[PDB]
Ligand binder design. Structure first.
Ligand SMILES: Nc1ncnc2c1ncn2[C@@H]1O[C@H](COP(=O)(O)OP(=O)(O)O)[C@@H](O)[C@H]1O
Lengths: 188, 75
């Protein structure tokens, strides 16, 4: 959705990327030229860098303020016209939906993963957002490793390199005997 | 007129003009659409007294408030 919203912005910037290969070029732009805001109004009232990205064809594209307006969709889905929550609201609600004795420890241990957290200047805005939402003086501590893109894979390798994994999967025979109910029982 | 006598090759009995005999929509009547007759007087009378309040509006890609809905007031 960040890439799709950026594609719409480039249509309004006069570039009309609408093909499929053009869409993956937009993905390359999103991964390379966008960056997150700190205060979108402080940066909205002032003009920016206007990065010059070069297409594989050799063309030249300029992005302007949309380089920070594109990944704003995560923290605010109102831009795309969708009543939902921000990513900060998801994190804060997910904490507050739990118990009370655990809220402080969950605030002190926030682990990111997923490729769409690699935006430059992301976690700092996440701290300002959650700090703006979380209670007073609670220590919010976000750990963001370098291998965020492969955390789910590395962890899959860790759990699959155990004997508990042998005591944890689903037997082929048992699947043939049961079917869907087998996996829905052993889903956790 | 006097170019006949003074010049040798200017002949007469010449038909100056050689000529020939000068010989001498259905898409709006479809059953699919509902053809509507546009009347600017009726539409003008309909939207005659409907104001539009443009007090502090925006349409650009400015993200400061939550949402952005221009044209707030009326009458
Ligand atoms: N350097 C980057 N900056 C911004 N976004 C990135 C970057 N690298 C990857 N991404 C985003 O991460 C996505 C990769 O998705 P990914 O997180 O791998 O899904 P999954 O983690 O479920 O495999 C890419 O589509 C891209 O939009």
């Amino acid at each position: 959705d960040v890439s799709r919203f950026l594609r719409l912005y480039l249509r309004k910037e006069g570039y009309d990327f609408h093909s499929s290969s053009e869409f993956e070029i937009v993905k390359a732009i999103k991964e390379r030229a966008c960056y997150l805001s700190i205060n979108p109004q402080k940066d909205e009232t002032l003009e920016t860098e206007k990065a010059q990205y070069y297409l594989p064809d050799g063309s030249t594209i300029e992005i302007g303020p949309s380089r920070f307006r594109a990944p704003e969709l995560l923290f605010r889905p109102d831009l795309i016209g969708e009543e939902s929550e921000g990513i900060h609201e998801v994190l804060v609600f997910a904490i507050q939906k739990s118990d009370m004795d655990l809220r402080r420890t969950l605030f002190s241990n926030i682990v990111l993963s997923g490729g769409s957290t690699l935006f430059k200047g992301f976690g700092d805005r996440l701290l300002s957002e959650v700090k703006k939402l979380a209670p007073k003086d609670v220590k919010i501590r976000i750990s963001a490793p370098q291998e965020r893109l492969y955390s789910t894979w590395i962890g899959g390798s860790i759990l699959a390199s155990l004997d508990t994994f042998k005591k944890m999967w689903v037997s082929k025979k048992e699947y043939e005997e049961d079917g869907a109910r087998s996996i829905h029982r052993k889903t956790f | 007129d006097p170019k006949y006598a003074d010049l040798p090759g200017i002949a007469r009995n010449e038909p100056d003009v050689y000529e020939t005999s000068d010989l001498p929509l259905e898409e709006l009547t479809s059953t699919s659409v509902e053809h509507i007759i546009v009347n600017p007087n009726a539409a003008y009378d309909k939207f005659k007294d409907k104001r539009v309040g443009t007090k502090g509006l925006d349409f650009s890609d400015r993200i400061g408030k939550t949402k952005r809905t221009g044209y707030e007031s009326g009458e």
